[PDB]
Amino acid sequence: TDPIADMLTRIRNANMVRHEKLEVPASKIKKEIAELLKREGFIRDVEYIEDNKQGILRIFLKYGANNERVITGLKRISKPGLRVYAKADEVPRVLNGLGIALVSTSKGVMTDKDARQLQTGGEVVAYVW
RNA sequence: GGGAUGCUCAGUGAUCCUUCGGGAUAUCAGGGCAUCCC
């Protein structure tokens, strides 16, 4: 069972059917992931919806001029039962820089460019392009 | 009993950095407390 993979799937599906928005149970790691996508321009918005359970992340997807989808793909990389780890010179490049690798470092979850910047490795959580 | 979360502790077990002395703590795995679900 893999909540992060679930989120990427719900986003992939919504994006196919070109939905405006979607929702996932909130967790801190998924919060961070959604925030990165916003800050990298892959989604239009994310917000936290209160529910006295564990919260909801409502994500607003992004489509371009003539309904061009801004997101092309999402890949779960690291997994429960097979974690994926990069040293700071081995942090993957997604589509020669046109995509992003989401990396969990001891200084938070950031892009692959941020990782190489800070000179750090970590868990390679996912790919978006 | 099993899941899913949050606050917190520690840190080498995993992982990362290192001038090899040490250092980081997001995630994984530990400790404590707490909420929600079957």
Author numbering: 27 to 155
Manuscript text:
The crystal structure of the aptamer RNA-2 in complex with Bacillus ribosomal protein S8 was solved by molecular replacement using the structure of unliganded B. anthracis S8 and refined against a 2.6 Å data set. The refined model contains all 38 nucleotides of the aptamer and residues 4–132 of the S8 protein. The structure of the aptamer-bound protein is very similar to the free protein (0.65 Å rmsd of the back bone atoms). The canonical A-form helical stem of the aptamer is interrupted by an internal loop that includes nucleotides A10-A14 on the 5′ strand and U25-A29 on the 3′ strand. A10 and A29 at one end of the loop adopt a cis Watson–Crick/Watson–Crick base pair via an A10 N1-A29 NH2 hydrogen bond and weak A10 H2-A29 N1 hydrogen bond (similar to that between A1912-A1927 in Haloarcula marismortui 23S rRNA). Stacked against the A10-A29 pair is a G11-(G13-C28) base triple. The G11 base is further locked into position by a hydrogen bond between G11 O6 and U25 2′-OH. This base triple stacks on a base quartet composed of residues U12, A14, U25 and U27. All but one of the protein–RNA contacts involve the sugar-phosphate backbone; the only base interaction is between A26 N3 and the side chain hydroxyl of S107. Also, the peptide bond between the highly conserved residues S107-T108-S109 stacks against the purine ring of A26. A26 functionally replaces A642 in the S8-aptamer complex.
